[PDB]
């Protein structure tokens, strides 16, 4: 009951009566584990933006970022390093763009690395995670361009350095699955396959059409790096899952999340990040809601639970408020974080009785993107 | 009167008797079987037209008369923009104007004089109760009278509904008589959001009545000599086709090197492209904008030549803020407004989509 | 103000993001920071690129394409926000996608976002 | 009671329906005029800011420009031009500091002059529109310096160079009164004239006392330069009036806002810009409100408005909002603008009855400061 | 909740715009973005520079300097923000002055204002 | 007992017997009737004190002694700083180890060594009594035990009330018994606020039971050698005070040219000032610190000479981040901070201050 606050007010108290002095600093922020939460803020498209950096289990605010314009976070699996790919001009807005890599140390959050990237080639968009990427051993930063054309940046972190842009097909996101290998969503309906080098055209195989043209695949699917598994909602909360953990692509049976009775009754997903994956339990979390079919971007006030495997239903929460995003943390007994970009506020769940435990608030002007490492 | 005039201009159309040899009509080049567009074979392949002596070639592509009845009589705007008349460089205020160039000029019809071609019209029967009937008696007999009717009853004929159908696939698909194939949809999408709609349709918001993809301006899209026409022509290795500049009255350095924003209507079925004639295929007029926007080697190459683009002939005064526009047409892109281009042909010019 | 509802079209104010045109808009409408329906305010750059949707107008029954161009080289304006997706699909059909910043083509190279235009381009099919 | 959106849309309606044709394009804003108001917004201390100009007859926004860290505005009177003093960083907030001048055009608001103040010379503070200030010709801007001491700069915007620091006592505020001439206020109670050739130290001469040293006197005094009236209210509401319009200060007769009973009874000026000051009628405006003494930055829910030559209260008007910032315009029948920060909206009132005629909402984070030119 | 009351301290919770040391703060409380009551946040640089004023305890009935320091060179935190002016002079009288950015002395020469954190540093008086 | 042992510190203390030609004792250099400094004039001015013999000068400054016990024993704190400890490089442990080297120092008191102290003590009846009541008969006879005896009856002197009274106008307005005037006040506020706690006040943050304004660490402040005083010293142009890096078991060269913070209690009156007393004025030493802040011309000139201060003694390890604060002290914050250092001046050294 008692707050981080009034814990805090009771402490400084403590110190003044028993005369305990202590040096005013720069606090060092807890090592990272499976309950830190990252909170990226886009702001609604503002020139400049935040991510904060989140004790999920105190529901604590550790430290923060600043990005520029919509810039894209990544977090190592492992917890050694955080970094984004970001944005800015000399004039605010207006005037000579630089987009830049920088790398963080994960507790003094101090940057180790700036990596200016040439000719200003960095895709603004609405923040999709899976549009700037890690490969599994957290050497190489790959990044989506859109113009002029569809190409994947390949950024040197242990040498801190640009190497080269791929040309690849029109495809779009970049889920690696090796040192030297990604997947993209292809126009066509397939999956494209880019083995690359440091010069010379990649490798790209396509993998058979898996969907049809009018099936919508959502811009914010799941992807668990370590499981090698894509979880991949339409519009409908038909689930297409693929298998890329042999390197190649294996198409997992479909599973809905909705029941047929609940979709003719208007349940659809939508949101922002509609889809969690937890490895370790191989569970799939939803967010639903009913609404129109083109109201897929609002916020849903219910989470989904269910098996991957069987596409059996689990659970279904009543979340208590208008939900943007969910992400879940890898550990057992995990936290369903739950992130609200109307009440600019994070509400941390357990996951399995879908309770709310705890909140974050004040988080920026429009907070949309949730992070967390899978370090277990 | 409405159909008579038009009638009269139906015959002078096709009638050879408007050439100082009598070889040549308005048909011979503005061949109806193809869109009104030269099918015959010169020096330069089908980039540009032989005249009446059977010698002389023009330094310009034919272009089609379908929809060219459409176009505003030559003004500036507001906006300091030329638009309308007619010839790629609009040297012509309008149809009417048009009509008589072409029987005096020795590359082309080659009459010497109006009184000429006055003796010509004079001899027909046809022609004396043809003109007469609209025009009074003794039209003909008059050289200033007869080649302003005759030019009159060409700007008729070219104003009927035989040379504007609106039938094509486009137009029954905007009735809602059919619908797109996803490629033409896509096509069609592709060219409403990129930047082919900044010159290629009629109006810069709304809905058009009767749309005929150009919006009637003057643009330098940095084109290079068509060399083989260029020579055909005789004009000179030294010579630099300035389009717009060139209409006596404009003085405007500005305006040196642009031309007039073709209709793509029935542009399927007309080739070579551009002023010169330069490009064969529909899809390497469409490549030819990547350039602007492409970064890859391929995007400088002209893919009929193997060899690079080349060379604005004007190389000042490009329409680059609307070329630049940051984004390349991929394969499957230039595929689909292929796909779109090919609805914009007339019904009865259909059949000439598999050739 | 049920934001889970069908959309409803109206033709009536173009400041409110029910506004017809503003079916698939997504961020802010040019006329509150000194713009108007389909101009940019002072100091922004205009966009050539932009994306596309078939919105229904109530007064006329008919469906117009909307060209939605940007604004850009400024912050983001901060008044009338709208958020609208009638037809939006997914990045991978990006003519029909809207979390993109359709800043392409802005003179001086003006990648920011600062507001929206809605234009009709063209009849709907 | 058609409201500006309301009439826009059925002019869309009439241009659709009539076939009329319009270029998209970059709209001018209108010809500057007597009731342009600009509110500019510190936003609470964000490392990227907001002005907003608006038309104050109509209440439309009709432009925007964008700032840098806590920048000052300044507006030519005869509305020739506007300018700012700005702050940026290459990563944010962090990193390599410019600091510069930028000049607009007020139709276009393109930048006319960007010119770069060596040595990171501003003062960054919570906006005092007289830390900057345009002399009377408007050739040279002059902005202050705290750090590493009180100084003020010198910026010539014809020839669009800075030409350096003059030093200055401890003294705060820049009055500019002639092409070479500016007064500022003293620690010690008093005034100084500073006169500055084109090279050389300033000849800087002190007036006498003019409070003691318990008399605390605001930091948002008005400052009419066409007058040479500078209007210097108290935490009391006690009101200094000195005339500088024959180049050398002369001292009017004190005047108190407030009678000596509403001092008792606790009425206390608050706010942020509390004072304005309206030339041709010789009037002052003071933002009043029952408080605590040392609640002297809240807002205030009244304004009095009292004559300036005798000091008789000619108005009292109940705002109807939290106000934090009061100005005027400086033509005739003039508009009272009241600025809330807490609501982010300009309320537009007529000055002569205190009545509520528009208002402009959604003006930034925390907007804070009203600029208007004097152009009658 | 009425600002223009006279202010009342309280000595249980720090997060909140009335805990005593925070009588004349301006800006942001560090404790809400991973600082403490006397500790600046992760990536961030402390400023040497303080304004300064006499806070009330009134748990132990004595008055303490509070020296006002700046943690500087981030974007403002946005979390518990409050502006508080007991004591609070104009800024001819900078030591007591609250608008300024006391961000002077900071590593890197930071000067962007993130928050403030609330020190004692001695007795009234 | 503790009295006892004070009282024979006291004896001690003004006793020339502990000087080889018994020309000087402790109270020579640190006279009480200058607050425990030395007001005779040598070579270089009041500087460097002159030692037994007549004619051999220090190279450091003669430091008061009130306070001087509220200082913790020499040791290494958990960020690496060292503290505390006596003599301006800290090479003396506590007050104990400290007092036996000014008798053996040839340039000192010049004692030849611990059985010749011990002699001159075994001469006195009154010390005999003294010592062997306290210590144990015979202490006197083992020169060992006599020297550290003396040493400890001295430490326990300089720890009486006497030596720390906390008595100044600045202890008397926090017990709330009077108040700064409005330049005072401003003084402190300044002191508080600027660069000059960061060092001068004991505890980082919170208050303190016993205030001597100073943190017992070691910094560099940049400070030129004294040319007449180093002249005088003897010790050649060629020598360089590497301050707390001369302290036996101390070999991290980042310690080098440091110098332990002085309490400011005093100060008003204690003048020359820093460890070699190049500055006479106090105004001087305080617009010492505004080299690193000021951009004027005149701060690069010491007002003293007319010319600029000089290069420091030692180039590295100065205290730059505490010292680079960003702001310059105006005349006026100078006269505040004279006026409030003058405050902390003890009772007893008030008519001094004229
Ligand atoms: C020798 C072949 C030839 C003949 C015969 C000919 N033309 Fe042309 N026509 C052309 C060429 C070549 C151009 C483009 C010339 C230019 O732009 O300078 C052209 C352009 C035109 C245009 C302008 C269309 C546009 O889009 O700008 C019209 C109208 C036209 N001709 C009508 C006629 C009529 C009517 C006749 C019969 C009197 C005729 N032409 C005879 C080859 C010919
Ligand atoms: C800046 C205005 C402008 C833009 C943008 C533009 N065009 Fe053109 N287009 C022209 C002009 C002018 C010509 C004639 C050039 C010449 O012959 O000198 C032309 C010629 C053509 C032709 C040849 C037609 C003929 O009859 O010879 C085709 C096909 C064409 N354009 C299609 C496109 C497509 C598809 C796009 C979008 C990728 C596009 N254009 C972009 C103005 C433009
Ligand atoms: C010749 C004059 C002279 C005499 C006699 C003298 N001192 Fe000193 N004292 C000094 C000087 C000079 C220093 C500084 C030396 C240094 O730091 O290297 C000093 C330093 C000290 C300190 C360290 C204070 C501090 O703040 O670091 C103490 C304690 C002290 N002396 C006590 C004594 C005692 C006890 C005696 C009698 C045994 C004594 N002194 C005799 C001149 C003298
Ligand atoms: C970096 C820590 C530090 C800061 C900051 C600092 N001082 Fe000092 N101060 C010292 C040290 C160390 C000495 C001794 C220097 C020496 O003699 O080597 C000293 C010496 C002095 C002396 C001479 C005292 C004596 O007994 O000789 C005065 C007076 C003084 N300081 C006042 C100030 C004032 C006032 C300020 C603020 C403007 C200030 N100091 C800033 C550490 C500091
Ligand atoms: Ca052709
Ligand atoms: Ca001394
Ligand atoms: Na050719
Ligand atoms: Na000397
Ligand atoms: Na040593």
């Given at each position: 009951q008692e707050t981080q606050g009034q814990a805090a007010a009771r402490a400084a108290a403590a110190d003044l009566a028993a005369g305990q002095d202590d040096e005013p600093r720069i606090l060092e922020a807890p090592a990272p584990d499976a309950r830190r939460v990252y909170v990226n803020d886009?702001?609604?498209?503002?020139a400049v933006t935040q991510q904060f950096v989140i004790d999920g289990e105190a529901g604590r605010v550790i430290g923060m970022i600043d990005g520029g314009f919509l810039p894209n976070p990544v977090v190592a699996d492992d917890g050694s390093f955080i970094a984004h790919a970001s944005t800015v001009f000399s004039r605010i807005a207006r005037g000579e763009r630089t987009d830049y890599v920088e790398v963080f140390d994960?507790?003094?959050?101090?940057?180790?690395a700036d990596i200016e990237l040439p000719d200003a080639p960095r895709f603004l968009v609405?923040?999709?995670?899976?549009m700037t990427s890690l490969t599994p051993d957290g050497k190489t930063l790959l990044f989506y361009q859109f113009s002029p054309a569809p190409a994947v940046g390949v950024v040197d972190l242990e040498g801190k350095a640009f190497k080269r842009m791929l040309d690849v097909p029109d495809c779009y996101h970049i889920f690696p699955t090796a040192p030297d290998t990604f997947f993209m969503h292809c126009r066509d309906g397939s999956l494209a396959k880019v083995a690359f080098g440091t010069e010379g055209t990649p490798e790209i195989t396509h993998t058979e059409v898996?969907?049809?043209?009018?099936e919508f695949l959502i811009n914010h699917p799941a992807y668990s790096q370590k499981a090698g598994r894509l979880v991949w909602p339409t519009y409908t909360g038909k689930i297409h899952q693929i298998d890329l953990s042999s390197g190649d692509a294996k198409f997992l049976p479909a599973v809905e999340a909705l029941t047929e009775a609940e979709r003719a009754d208007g349940w659809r997903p939508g949101g922002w990040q509609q889809v969690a994956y937890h490895r370790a339990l191989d569970r799939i979390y939803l967010l639903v809601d009913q609404r129109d079919?083109?109201?897929?971007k609002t916020a849903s006030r219910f989470v989904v639970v269910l098996d991957?495997?069987?596409?059996?239903?689990?659970a279904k929460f009543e979340m208590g408020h208008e939900i943007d995003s969910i992400n879940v943390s890898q550990d057992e007994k995990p936290l369903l974080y739950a992130l609200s970009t109307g009440d600019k506020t994070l509400y941390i769940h357990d996951?399995?009785?879908?309770?709310?435990?705890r909140s974050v608030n004040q988080l920026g002007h429009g907070p949309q993107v949730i992070t967390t490492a899978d370090m277990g | 009167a409405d159909d008579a005039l038009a009638a009269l201009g139906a015959q002078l159309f096709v009638d050879?008797?408007?050439?100082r040899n009598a070889?040549?009509?308005?048909?011979?080049?503005?061949d109806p079987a193809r869109a009104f567009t030269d099918p015959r074979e010169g020096k330069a392949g089908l980039a540009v037209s032989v005249g009446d002596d059977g010698q002389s070639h023009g330094d310009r592509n034919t272009p089609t008369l379908?929809?060219?009845?459409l176009v505003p009589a030559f003004h500036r705007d507001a906006n300091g923009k030329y638009k309308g008349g007619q010839f790629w460089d609009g040297r012509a205020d309008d149809l009417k104007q048009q009509a008589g160039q072409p029987m005096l000029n020795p590359v082309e019809?080659?009459?010497?004089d109006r009184a000429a071609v006055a003796a010509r019209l004079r001899d027909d029967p046809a022609y004396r109760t043809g003109f007469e009937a609209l025009?009074?008696?003794?039209?003909?007999?008059?050289p200033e009278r007869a080649f302003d009717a005759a030019a009159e009853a060409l700007a008729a004929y070219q104003a009927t509904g035989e040379f504007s159908?609106?039938?094509?696939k486009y137009d029954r698909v905007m009735r809602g008589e059919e619908k797109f194939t996803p490629l033409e949809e896509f096509g069609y999408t592709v060219f409403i959001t990129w930047?082919?709609?900044?010159?290629?349709?009629?109006?810069?918001?709304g809905v058009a009545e009767?749309?005929?993809?150009?919006?009637?301006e003057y643009h330098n899209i940095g084109l290079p000599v068509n060399e083989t026409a260029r020579e055909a022509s005789?004009?000179?290795?030294?010579?630099?086709?300035?389009g717009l500049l060139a209409r006596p009255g404009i003085e405007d350095?500005?305006?040196?090197?642009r031309f007039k924003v073709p209709s793509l209507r029935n542009v399927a079925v007309?080739?070579?492209?551009?002023h010169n004639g330069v490009f064969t295929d529909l899809r390497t007029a469409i490549l030819?904008?990547?350039?602007?926007?492409?970064?890859?080697?391929?995007?400088?190459?002209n893919p009929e030549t193997?060899?690079?683009?080349?060379?604005?002939?004007?190389?000042?005064?490009?329409s680059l803020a609307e070329l630049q526009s940051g984004l390349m047409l991929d394969d499957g892109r230039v595929d689909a407004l292929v796909a779109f281009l090919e609805t914009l042909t007339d019904r009865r010019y259909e059949p000439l989509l598999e050739e | 103000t049920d934001p889970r509802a069908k959309w409803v079209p109206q033709?009536?104010?173009?400041?409110?993001?029910?506004?017809?045109?503003?079916?698939?808009?997504?961020?802010?409408?040019?006329d509150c920071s000194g713009g108007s329906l389909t101009n940019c305010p002072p100091g922004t750059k205009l966009a050539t690129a932009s994306w596309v949707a078939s919105c229904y107008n109530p007064t006329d029954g008919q469906s117009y394409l909307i060209a939605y161009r940007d604004c850009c080289?400024?912050?983001?304006?901060?008044?009338?926000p709208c958020l609208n997706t009638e037809g939006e699909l997914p990045v991978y059909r990006?003519?029909?996608?809207?979390?993109?910043?359709?800043?392409?083509?802005?003179e001086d190279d003006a990648m920011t976002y600062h507001c929206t235009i809605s234009p009709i381009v063209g009849k709907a099919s």
């Open positions: 886009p702001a609604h498209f503002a994960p507790v003094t959050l101090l940057p180790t609405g923040t999709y995670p899976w898996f969907h049809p043209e009018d079919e083109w109201r897929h991957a495997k069987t596409g059996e239903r689990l996951a399995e009785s879908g309770e709310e435990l | 050879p008797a408007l050439s070889t040549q009509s308005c048909a011979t080049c503005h379908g929809y060219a009845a019809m080659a009459m010497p025009f009074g008696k003794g039209v003909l007999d008059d159908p609106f039938d094509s930047n082919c709609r900044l010159c290629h349709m009629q109006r810069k918001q009767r749309e005929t993809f150009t919006n009637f005789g004009l000179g290795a030294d010579h630099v086709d300035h350095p500005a305006q040196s090197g007309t080739g070579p492209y551009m030819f904008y990547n350039k602007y926007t492409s970064r890859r080697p391929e995007a400088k190459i193997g060899a690079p683009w080349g060379e604005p002939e004007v190389a000042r005064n490009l | 033709d009536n104010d173009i400041q409110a993001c029910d506004y017809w045109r503003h079916c698939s808009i997504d961020g802010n409408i040019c080289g400024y912050n983001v304006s901060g008044r009338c990006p003519e029909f996608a809207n979390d993109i910043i359709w800043c392409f083509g802005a």
